[PDB]
Design a binder for this molecule. Structure first.
Ligand SMILES: [K+]
Ligand SMILES: [K+]
Ligand SMILES: [K+]
Ligand SMILES: [K+]
Ligand SMILES: [K+]
Ligand SMILES: [K+]
Ligand SMILES: [Mg+2]
Ligand SMILES: [Mg+2]
Ligand SMILES: [Mg+2]
Ligand SMILES: [Mg+2]
Ligand SMILES: [Mg+2]
Ligand SMILES: [Mg+2]
Ligand SMILES: [Mg+2]
Ligand SMILES: [Mg+2]
Ligand SMILES: [Mg+2]
Ligand SMILES: [Mg+2]
Ligand SMILES: [Mg+2]
Ligand SMILES: [Mg+2]
Ligand SMILES: [Mg+2]
Ligand SMILES: [Mg+2]
Ligand SMILES: [Mg+2]
Ligand SMILES: [Mg+2]
Ligand SMILES: [Mg+2]
Ligand SMILES: [Mg+2]
Ligand SMILES: [Mg+2]
Ligand SMILES: [Mg+2]
Ligand SMILES: [Mg+2]
Ligand SMILES: [Mg+2]
Ligand SMILES: [Mg+2]
Ligand SMILES: [Mg+2]
Ligand SMILES: [Mg+2]
Ligand SMILES: [Mg+2]
Ligand SMILES: [Mg+2]
Ligand SMILES: [Mg+2]
Ligand SMILES: [Mg+2]
Ligand SMILES: [Mg+2]
Ligand SMILES: [Mg+2]
Ligand SMILES: [Mg+2]
Ligand SMILES: [Mg+2]
Ligand SMILES: [Mg+2]
Ligand SMILES: [Mg+2]
Ligand SMILES: [Mg+2]
Ligand SMILES: [Mg+2]
Ligand SMILES: [Mg+2]
Ligand SMILES: [Mg+2]
Ligand SMILES: [Mg+2]
Ligand SMILES: [Mg+2]
Ligand SMILES: [Mg+2]
Ligand SMILES: [Mg+2]
Ligand SMILES: [Mg+2]
Ligand SMILES: [Mg+2]
Ligand SMILES: [Mg+2]
Ligand SMILES: [Mg+2]
Ligand SMILES: [Mg+2]
Ligand SMILES: [Mg+2]
Ligand SMILES: [Mg+2]
Ligand SMILES: [Mg+2]
Ligand SMILES: [Mg+2]
Ligand SMILES: [Mg+2]
Ligand SMILES: [Mg+2]
Ligand SMILES: [Mg+2]
Ligand SMILES: [Mg+2]
Lengths: 44, 274
RNA sequence: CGCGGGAUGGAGCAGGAGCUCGUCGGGCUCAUAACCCGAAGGCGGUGGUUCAAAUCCGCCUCCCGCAACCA
RNA sequence: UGAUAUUGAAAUUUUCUAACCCGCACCACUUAUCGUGGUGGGAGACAGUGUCAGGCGGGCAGUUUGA
RNA sequence: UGAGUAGCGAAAGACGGGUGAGAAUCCCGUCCACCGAUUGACUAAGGUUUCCAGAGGAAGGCUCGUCCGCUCUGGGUUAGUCGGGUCCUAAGCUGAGGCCGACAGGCGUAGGCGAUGGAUAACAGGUUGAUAUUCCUGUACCACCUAUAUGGGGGGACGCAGUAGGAUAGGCGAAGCGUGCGAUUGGAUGCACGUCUAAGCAGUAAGGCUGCUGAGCUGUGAUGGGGAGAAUUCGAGUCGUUGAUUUCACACUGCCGAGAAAAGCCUCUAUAGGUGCCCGUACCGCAAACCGACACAGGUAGUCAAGAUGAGAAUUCUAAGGUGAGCGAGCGAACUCUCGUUAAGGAACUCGGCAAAAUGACCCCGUAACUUCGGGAGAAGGGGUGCUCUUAGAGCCGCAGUGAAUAGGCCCAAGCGACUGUUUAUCAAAAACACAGGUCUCUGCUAAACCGUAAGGUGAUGUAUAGGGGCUGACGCCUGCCCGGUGCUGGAAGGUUAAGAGGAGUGGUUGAAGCUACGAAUCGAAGCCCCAGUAAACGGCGGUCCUAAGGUAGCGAAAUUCCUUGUCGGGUAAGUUCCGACCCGCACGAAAGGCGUAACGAUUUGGGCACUGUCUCAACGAGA
RNA sequence: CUACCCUUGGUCAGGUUGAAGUUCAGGUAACACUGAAUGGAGGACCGAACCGACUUACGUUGAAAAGUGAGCGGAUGAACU
RNA sequence: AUCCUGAGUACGACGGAGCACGUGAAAUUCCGUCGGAAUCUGGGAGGACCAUCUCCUAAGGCUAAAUACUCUCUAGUG
RNA sequence: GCCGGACCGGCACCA
């Protein structure tokens, strides 16, 4: 059966990547939250 | 003329089509073509704002000269051609300086005819003139609403208007809908009636042909749910069940007039269409 | 099975008893009908409230309307 | 839908132009269907917009709908 | 605990030899078996070292393990030409100025980014444990470098179907050549394979179009290579037939639904030497490495496409190649599952013929009611297929000849829906939705409608033969009455009302004025009250009385009928279902359409034939 | 993932039926009309790939959190990808 | 007190808001719309408002400290 | 309750 996750390097980077997060105010809020929590990984 | 298909299949039963006899050239003028991607009833936000639009055959736009603002130069009708973007056929005309333009093809126009535009042009089918120089009683089409803007009225297949009178700086015209209204006398119109008169006689015949034309199915409100439509819900089939039939957005949709008041054309419209 | 409404000259309707048709007598007509003129004739019942009851109290004998279910 | 502000000028609703408006034409910025200016044309103290007011308003909302 | 219980995830293995502490499970060999429009081969995504060699056996592997996609150590991916960038644009995204918006921000012009498309120069052979159009060999091509010698136009550039051809690839046959082999089972002297070689460069060329184009062929490339082969040297590349799904080529014809852009490119205003970057390249890849928690019977785009049989990429057996499936050994109980057969009967089973049986290919006869004249139709129902010989006959054999496998069951009647299509991913595929067609209504264009606070948009680069919304739902015949109520449309300014205008007048305070709190006539819109019209608007179509008016046509115990298994007829031996009638319509009825309707249906319902383990009534056999 | 849409690509073994036109022949005053051949239309027919999911059996601490076996619907289109 | 001393301001009407205070007899402060003063013989406030008295002098600006907090640093505490 | 006609018709209605 076809499952929900169909990985795609380009789609992953374009939707969840660092530059996409930077492009919006709320995305920069995401990055700030992860930096505050101390995450090793900030984005895709 | 109209050709009626034999009932070889249930789909072909009662189906009719135009024979396209009046079409002389089956290919368009390359230099007058522009791309025309489909919007499918979706606006700049990406949201669907007009229902029942989508799909359909790919089309290329033909640049049409609605303005007819090339005066004093005779143009010869090169061909009559199919236009997927409008009900009327179009005419490829070649001016004496070699420039080629597309015009709405009027009824009775033929290959080799000479057309012209301007105040001094003769009253003949295909000639474009200001409404000030068109005699009363003349059948016209492609009528401007503002000088130099280009024809906006009576462009559909078989559409025409009759010049009724000349009052001051305005000309009284009767439109296809029956409404009689004033139009600035410096506005231009083309002599004659738009061709392709049998366009309206076509029996589409099957659902697929509408799909080719790009029309997606219409779902009746009464077979929806209450959260979708005021006509939704009810056990089994249901009548309207409210004082007036409703649009999907909760507005009365049978007889309720929607033309706004305080329009500048209120003083220009003499008789309503009804 | 629960709730409610009705019983008016002979007929259909009004409602502390009148309109129309029906009957009788006379007239008009060759005769009948139609028509015209006069006369008579009535609160479904059973008990009570009431100075006094078609009228109000409850019930009785039928008809009529809504409803008689969630399993 | 009315008042009032933007909002002016003359007759007695009509007129005018100059504010305001034009998903109107031409020109320039400019290899530009945006915009901004310029000129014409249309319209015009109306419209639009602000404030106040009356009306409509299951289109949408918060709730009530006893024992 | 359940319990040494369930399970150990589709299937064919056997033996010999080896290794080893230990072997059904690892390696080698022989035989056997399975796939083969694929279990074969090659691209892409995705994964990211899983790739290779040596070593190892704790844990992982549903058993075992000496083995591994596991552990340890060391390795492996080579490009001017392949794919991408240093080229082009599509949707879309972004956007200098700009427009809009409490903020945050939204939009948008020029421009820019952006392949799934356009442009663009390299082939063949060899080689490793692991890379190869990348390394090597031979032979090329492209861009640039050095020396000798900006506007116009065109083009790119395009759909779908079908047909007739040319060529080539590929298949087949003869063996023309070549290479082998030549048989201890009765016989013969026949048996089995091979039969090629690119880009580039010159010559040419079937065609096609109105000179331009054009598949392909020939030579060269190539005393090179590769080769069925013999013991490093030597070795054949020929005749016929068939023939593409490839290519000429979206060339030609036809059709309506009318089929990108931009750049590269075109056109008008030699030789010689040298240089040539970055990213990817391992491996898996219809899967044990991807998505499914798994070494999971699932899902995963494209390409290549052999023989016999055949219409076929169907069927069965095979080729190339790959595989024997990560628990086994016995036994051959019940019971369960998957298969095969079955006396006599043949739907008696059951809610219901559910399931199964039956039909089935090709060729020839032959084919009804009804019909929208197309259909219905493969209607139905019947005949023939083997092999040998002669040139349609004569023979031969079997129980049986499309001898296997694969390949419609059919008929009669009724409800519903015209039809193909769509739907509740995961209990409903339908009579529901859609539909072509009909009608009503809105909308004169900065249209109406819709999204958005707006700007900006969709509608539409459309313009009443157009666009939006409501209802109905092919087609045929048709669609009756009611405008009193509600809605909608149009009148009227008579009454009623708000802000605002207006100030009669009254009080507080100081005889006042002043300040102050109120404040009455009168004016002041839409709406409403009123009138009219409108039913394919919402609705309504009763009980002499009343109403706005009391059901026309057609249909009717119906997908509607409660009584009810109404009554009568047909069908059965027997029929609460079915069909045909009646009308007493609890409680049909004309676009929430009425009545019919050929064709269509994995629709619902009744009957019949064929057929059968559905059943009387079970029995035996195969496998898990 | 799924619904719908936008741009740009790709795919559909084989059989069957035989629409419109055209030509020839009859026929006419001229048309209508007719037969034969040609032609190859269709949300056409049968049926693989492919897309579905009607029935049934199995599975129901599954091989699988929706599957498998056998039949079944569509299969040039409102097709699938 | 001859001159100057903050004008679309103060203030008012309407609609709101902030004031403990829900429009209330609601003073006092602010916003939008519209109107709109006076000038030391002036102007504002003392909880509607008037008068008297009392206090003050809006419509310009600047101004440490006592106050709030702890991701930190230094030294310590329970 | 406020008002216009002959109760009717609009408006008003926060113990
Ligand atoms: K990759
Ligand atoms: K046993
Ligand atoms: K319409
Ligand atoms: K009405
Ligand atoms: K597509
Ligand atoms: K106030
Ligand atoms: Mg629509
Ligand atoms: Mg529904
Ligand atoms: Mg609703
Ligand atoms: Mg309803
Ligand atoms: Mg109902
Ligand atoms: Mg509600
Ligand atoms: Mg609450
Ligand atoms: Mg209770
Ligand atoms: Mg235990
Ligand atoms: Mg045991
Ligand atoms: Mg046990
Ligand atoms: Mg056991
Ligand atoms: Mg077991
Ligand atoms: Mg296994
Ligand atoms: Mg494979
Ligand atoms: Mg390995
Ligand atoms: Mg183990
Ligand atoms: Mg390893
Ligand atoms: Mg933008
Ligand atoms: Mg390799
Ligand atoms: Mg590789
Ligand atoms: Mg993994
Ligand atoms: Mg798997
Ligand atoms: Mg799979
Ligand atoms: Mg697939
Ligand atoms: Mg096969
Ligand atoms: Mg395994
Ligand atoms: Mg038997
Ligand atoms: Mg037998
Ligand atoms: Mg039998
Ligand atoms: Mg039986
Ligand atoms: Mg029985
Ligand atoms: Mg069956
Ligand atoms: Mg067969
Ligand atoms: Mg259907
Ligand atoms: Mg269907
Ligand atoms: Mg379901
Ligand atoms: Mg289902
Ligand atoms: Mg319907
Ligand atoms: Mg009326
Ligand atoms: Mg009427
Ligand atoms: Mg009943
Ligand atoms: Mg009905
Ligand atoms: Mg009707
Ligand atoms: Mg109706
Ligand atoms: Mg119907
Ligand atoms: Mg059967
Ligand atoms: Mg067994
Ligand atoms: Mg293929
Ligand atoms: Mg079909
Ligand atoms: Mg089929
Ligand atoms: Mg589905
Ligand atoms: Mg299946
Ligand atoms: Mg079928
Ligand atoms: Mg004050
Ligand atoms: Mg001051």
């Amino acid at each position: 059966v076809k499952r929900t996750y169909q990985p795609n390097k380009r789609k992953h980077s374009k939707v969840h990547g660092f530059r996409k997060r930077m492009s919006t105010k709320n995305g920069r809020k995401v990055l700030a939250r992860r930096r505050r929590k101390g995450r090793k990984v900030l984005s895709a | 003329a109209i050709k009626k298909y034999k009932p070889i299949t249930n789909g072909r039963r009662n189906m009719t089509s135009l024979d396209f006899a009046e079409i002389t050239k089956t290919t368009p003028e390359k230099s007058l073509l522009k791309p025309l991607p489909k919007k499918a009833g979706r606006n700049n936000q990406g949201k669907l704002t007009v229902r029942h639009h989508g799909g359909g055959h790919k089309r290329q736009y033909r640049v049409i000269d609605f303005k007819r603002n090339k005066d004093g130069i005779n143009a010869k009708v090169d061909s009559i051609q199919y236009d997927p973007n409008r009900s009327a056929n179009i005419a490829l005309v070649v001016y004496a300086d070699g420039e080629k333009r597309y015009i709405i093809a009027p009824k009775g126009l033929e290959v080799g005819q000479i057309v012209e535009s301007g105040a001094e042009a003769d009253i003949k089918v295909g000639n474009a003139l200001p409404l000030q120089n068109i005699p009363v009683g003349t059948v016209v089409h492609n009528i401007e609403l503002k000088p130099g803007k280009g024809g906006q009225i009576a462009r559909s297949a078989g559409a025409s208007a009759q010049v009724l009178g000349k009052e001051g700086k305005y000309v009284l015209i009767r439109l296809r809908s029956g409404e009689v209204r004033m139009i600035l006398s410096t506005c231009r119109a083309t002599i004659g009636q738009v061709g392709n008169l049998q366009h309206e006689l076509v029996n589409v015949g099957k659902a697929g042909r509408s799909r080719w034309k790009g029309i997606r199915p219409t779902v009746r409100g009464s077979v929806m749910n209450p959260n979708d439509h005021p006509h939704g819900g009810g056990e089994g089939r249901a009548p309207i069940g409210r004082p007036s039939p409703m649009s999907p957005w909760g507005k009365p949709t049978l007889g309720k007039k929607t033309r706004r008041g305080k329009k500048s054309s209120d003083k220009l419209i003499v008789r309503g269409r009804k």
